[PDB]
C-alpha cells in the first residue's frame, strides 16, 4: 500500500546454544562447536592394533618368577602396554624383594617379542637337591610348592658342594635372567638347609659383577615366614655368558626369557578387562577416539592423545547472535 522497501538483515533460528566472549557471557548463537573431548568407550583396547598384557590377579614379579597361581599363563608374546590391578593378590608368595623392580617393569611395559626358554634344567644339579625347595607360603594344589621358573636348591646328603656353573647366550636375542638369594633366620635353619654356615652367591657377566651374602637375622612373619628371598636380574646380551658361583642360599635360574625391545610405554593401573577394541589413546577408565585438541577424561593416558585440561566446555561460536 505504501512506498516500496528493501531491508538488509541476517538470519536467526531455534538454537538455544550459548557461548562466552571476553566481554560477554551466556550469549545465544545460531550454531556452535565444542572442541573439548569428553567421552570414552569404557574399554581396555589394543593400542594401534597391539593387545596389551593384562595380568589378572598377578604382579609383574609374580608373573615373571612364576608364582604358582600366576602360571595360569600361556602367552603372549608381544604387547603394547601392561595393565595391573591396583592390588594384585599374587605377588611374591615367599616374601622378599625384586631389585630394580620399577625399572624392570618399565623395560617390560612394551615388548616386541617375549619367549620363555629353559636355560638350565633341574637335571643338571646332580650333587644338590632340587625337589625339596618348597614352602607353605607359596602353595599350589593344596600341596606347598614354589616359584616355578627358578629353583630353590638345598643340600644333598649332608653336603652343599660349591657350584660353579656358566651359561652362554647362544640366541639371536638378548635374554632376561632372574636368580635370587635366601636369607635364613638362624644358624640352625642354615645348616639344616645348606650345611655350610658362611655362604655367598656371586654372579658375573661382561657387565655384571655382584656378590650376595645372606643376612641371618630375625624378622617378623609375612605369609607365615620370617625368611626372606631377594631376587635380581640382568639382560644377558647375545654371545655373552653369565657365571654363577655359590656354596649356599642360591635360588637358581631354570627358565629365562628372550626379549626384543623397540619402544617404551608404561604400566596402567586399572580394574577393567579387555574390550576387544582398538584405539590410539587409552585411559584406565576407557579409550578415547577423537581429533579434538583437548580432553578432560583422565590424566594417565597412554597413546597419542589430546591435551588434558580442567574444563567442562570449550564452545566455539560459528553462527551469529540469535534474538527472540
Amino acid at each position: 500500500l505504501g512506498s516500496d522497501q528493501i531491508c538488509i538483515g541476517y538470519h536467526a533460528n531455534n538454537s538455544t546454544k550459548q557461548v562466552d566472549t571476553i566481554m560477554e557471557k551466556n550469549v545465544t548463537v545460531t550454531h556452535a562447536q565444542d572442541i573439548l573431548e569428553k567421552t570414552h568407550n569404557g574399554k581396555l583396547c589394543d593400542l594401534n592394533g597391539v593387545k596389551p598384557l593384562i595380568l589378572k590377579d598377578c604382579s609383574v614379579a609374580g608373573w615373571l618368577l612364576g608364582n604358582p597361581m600366576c602360571d595360569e599363563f600361556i602367552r603372549v608374546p608381544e604387547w603394547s602396554y601392561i595393565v595391573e590391578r591396583a592390588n594384585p593378590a599374587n605377588d611374591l608368595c615367599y616374601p622378599g624383594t625384586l631389585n630394580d623392580y620399577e625399572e624392570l617393569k618399565h623395560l617390560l611395559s612394551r615388548i616386541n617379542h617375549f619367549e620363555k626358554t629353559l636355560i638350565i634344567p633341574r637335571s643338571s644339579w646332580p650333587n644338590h637337591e632340587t625337589s625339596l625347595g618348597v614352602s607353605a607360603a607359596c602353595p599350589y594344589q593344596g600341596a606347598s610348592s614354589f616359584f616355578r621358573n627358578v629353583v630353590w636348591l638345598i643340600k644333598k646328603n649332608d653336603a652343599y658342594p660349591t657350584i660353579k656353573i656358566s651359561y652362554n647366550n647362544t640366541n639371536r636375542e638378548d635374554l632376561l635372567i632372574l636368580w635370587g638369594i635366601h636369607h635364613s633366620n638362624n644358624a640352625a635353619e642354615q645348616t639344616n638347609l645348606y650345611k655350610n654356615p658362611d655362604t655367598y652367591v656371586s654372579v658375573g657377566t661382561s657387565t655384571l659383577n655382584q656378590r650376595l651374602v645372606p643376612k641371618i637375622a630375625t624378622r617378623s612373619q609375612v605369609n607365615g615366614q620370617s625368611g626372606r628371598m631377594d631376587f635380581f636380574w640382568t639382560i644377558l646380551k647375545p654371545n655373552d655368558a653369565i657365571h654363577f658361583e655359590s656354596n649356599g642360599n642360591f635360588i637358581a635360574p631354570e627358565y629365562a626369557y628372550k626379549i626384543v625391545k623397540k619402544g617404551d610405554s608404561t604400566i596402567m593401573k586399572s580394574e577393567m578387562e579387555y574390550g576387544h577394541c582398538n584405539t590410539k589413546c587409552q585411559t584406565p577408565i576407557g579409550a578415547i577416539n577423537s581429533s579434538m585438541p583437548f580432553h578432560n577424561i583422565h590424566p594417565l593416558t597412554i597413546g597419542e592423545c589430546p591435551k588434558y585440561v580442567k574444563s567442562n566446555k570449550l564452545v566455539l561460536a560459528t553462527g551469529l547472535r540469535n534474538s527472540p
Partner: protein, 176 residues
C-alpha cells in the same frame, strides 16, 4: 568490536530467511520476500569453518604417553612429575579458555562487519533515490519492481534511470 549493527541499528534477525546467513527482505506491489546474499554467506561459512579447523589442525602434535612408576623412597622425583603434569595442565587450560573467549568475540564481530558491509554496498548505490529509515531499511522514492529489486541485490542498480521519478516524489512529500 561492534561494527554498526547486528544487535544495533538492526534490531533482530530474519527467522524466516533460511537460504543463507545474510540477505535482504523487500516489499512492493508484486509481493514481498527474503533472499540471501549467497556470495556473502559463503565467504563467512568458509572463514568460520577455516577458523575452527585451524584451531584443531595446528595442535598436530599429539605425541606419546604414560602414568605412575616411582616408589615409596622416590617421592621427591614423583613430586617433580606432579609439578610438571600440573604445570602443563595449568598452561593448556588457560590458553584454551582464553582462545575460546577471544576467538568468539572476533567471530561475532566478523558477522557484524559482513552485514554492515552489505548495508553499505546498497546504500552507496541508491542515495537520494531512497530514504535511510535507519533501522536497516530503505524506503524507495521511486517505484521498484522485482526486476529492479534484483538489480540492487546484485550491485547493478541504475541510478541515472530513476533519478527523476524520485526528484518528483520529493516535491510531493514537501507539500499536501
Amino acid at each position: 568490536g561492534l561494527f554498526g549493527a547486528i544487535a544495533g541499528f538492526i534490531e533482530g534477525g530474519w527467522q524466516g530467511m533460511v537460504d543463507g546467513w545474510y540477505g535482504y527482505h523487500h516489499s512492493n506491489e508484486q509481493g514481498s520476500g527474503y533472499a540471501a546474499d549467497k556470495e556473502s554467506t559463503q565467504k563467512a561459512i568458509d572463514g568460520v569453518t577455516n577458523k575452527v579447523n585451524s584451531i584443531i589442525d595446528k595442535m598436530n602434535t599429539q605425541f606419546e604417553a604414560v602414568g605412575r612408576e616411582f616408589n615409596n623412597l622416590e617421592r621427591r622425583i614423583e613430586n617433580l612429575n606432579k609439578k610438571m603434569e600440573d604445570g602443563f595442565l595449568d598452561v593448556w587450560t588457560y590458553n584454551a579458555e582464553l582462545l575460546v573467549l577471544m576467538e568468539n568475540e572476533r567471530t561475532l564481530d566478523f558477522h557484524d562487519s559482513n552485514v554492515k558491509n552489505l548495508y553499505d554496498k546498497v546504500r552507496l548505490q541508491l542515495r537520494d533515490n531512497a530514504k535511510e529509515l535507519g533501522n536497516g531499511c530503505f524506503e524507495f522514492y521511486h517505484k521498484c519492481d522485482n526486476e529492479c529489486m534484483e538489480s540492487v541485490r546484485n550491485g547493478t542498480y541504475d541510478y541515472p534511470k530513476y533519478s527523476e521519478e524520485a526528484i518528483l516524489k520529493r516535491e510531493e512529500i514537501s507539500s499536501g
